[PDB]
Amino acid sequence: EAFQLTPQQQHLIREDCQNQKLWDEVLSHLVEGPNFLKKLEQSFMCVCCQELVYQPVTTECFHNVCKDCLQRSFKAQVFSCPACRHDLGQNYIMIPNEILQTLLDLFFPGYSKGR
Ligand SMILES: [Zn+2]
Ligand SMILES: [Zn+2]
Secondary structure (H helix, E strand, O other), X not given: OOOOOOHHHHHHHHHOHHHHHHHHHHHHHHHHHHHHHHHHHHHOEXXXXXXXXXXXXXXXXXXXXXXXXXXXXXXXXXXXXXXXXXXOOOOOOOOEOHHHHHHHXXXXXXXXXXX
8 A cells, every 4th residue: 555666766766866865755655655646746846936846956955946946046146055055156057857857757747748
């Protein structure tokens, strides 16, 4: 009755090492069965737009934020992590975490429409 991860999800979670600590916390909730998807969605909620992160950038301070939302923040001369306020620097290279994107697409098929 525990939520059962597919081989694909197990593979990608392993490969998503920038999020290692977070994934280990998230998988605590596999026991919660169908409700795991809910706690999963809450874990990858974006602090800026308050939706499941889309094209997430995983920051060096371990926070996932939509690339679009971090770009809005920088344009407003804020070079800080919106989740924890760690200074990222004006020159920060924003690289989407495509492993995490693919994971979210697997867990929530179709969620990214229109984003
Ligand atoms: Zn966002
Ligand atoms: Zn942060």
